[PDB]
Amino acid sequence: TLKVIGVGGGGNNAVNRMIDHGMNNVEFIAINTDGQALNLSKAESKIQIGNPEIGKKAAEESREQIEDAIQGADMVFVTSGMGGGTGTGAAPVVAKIAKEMGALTVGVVTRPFSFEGRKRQTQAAAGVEAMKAAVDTLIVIPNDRLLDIVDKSTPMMEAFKEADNVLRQGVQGISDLIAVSGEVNLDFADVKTIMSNQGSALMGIGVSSGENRAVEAAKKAISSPLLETSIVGAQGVLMNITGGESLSLFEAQEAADIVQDAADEDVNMIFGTVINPELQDEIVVTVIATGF
Ligand SMILES: Nc1nc2c(ncn2[C@@H]2O[C@H](COP(=O)(O)OP(=O)(O)OP(=O)(O)O)[C@@H](O)[C@H]2O)c(=O)[nH]1
């Protein structure tokens, strides 16, 4: 039982992208203060709660409504945009409740763009520290590093939809590996071994389609701009290899071995594969490195 919880406006929009893109392994929950924007959410479960301190007390006042929604989950994803009042303060509370209930809590959050001002960057920094305390592992993508990812052509009014896509890839990276119906999935106990109480995590994404797509997508994930460091400093590595119906076990093994050779000699590496047939010839390699 996996649940991804979008906290705040930006977090809700990512969840809505997470649903438009096929991701049915998981139960979706949306939490916000703005009721109208909650009605425009696509998640099954919606919870209205109620400067990042309003968000906090709103979440704490709705502790039991949040507790009820998460009930039964084994792992929970809390995705939010840090910076605003709602997500920055409420998302650490939703995470801390999830971790108290025994769920493996994974935070996938964003730092705002530089063009959003220092105050929004200052509050986001405090939210990030709050979330690190709350979750098992936290993935933080600074929105500024999408400029090292997006096209020269990217419109400025499209900028927050690429943020949605990156948060989609963070959650779907791990979520697709654990409970899809086509079961060459991994074992949950081993996932816990890589995520539990670790803290700060890196994410690498690589896409390719050639004859040597496996080697190419793995090298590009190893050196994805989203990684702030090389994964060599990492103790545990969770790797996802998503392909179409032509994805081979050899290709997965090849890509896993390339990543494992870049990690620390005695990393704890677990990897799995996901067949999604909308993808034709391109494979996507997602690497999650933990413990920093
Ligand atoms: N991925 C994504 N991020 C967004 C989006 N909109 C804003 N963000 C980022 O997330 C940060 C917080 O924005 P919101 O989530 O809308 O703020 P909030 O949580 O609703 O808090 P409030 O101020 O009470 O509305 C902003 O600084 C942006 O950097 C979005 O649509 N998608």
Residue numbers in the entry: 13 to 62, 74 to 315
Quoted from the paper:
FtsZ is an ancient, filament-forming, tubulin-like GTPase protein found in the vast majority of bacteria and archaea, where it acts as a central component of the cell division machinery (1–3). Here, using X-ray crystallography of Staphylococcus aureus FtsZ (SaFtsZ), we reveal how an FtsZ can adopt two functionally distinct conformations, open and closed. The closed form is found within several crystal forms of two nonpolymerizing SaFtsZ mutants and corresponds to many previous FtsZ structures from other organisms. We argue that FtsZ’s conformational switch is polymerization-associated, driven by the formation of the longitudinal intersubunit interfaces along the filament.
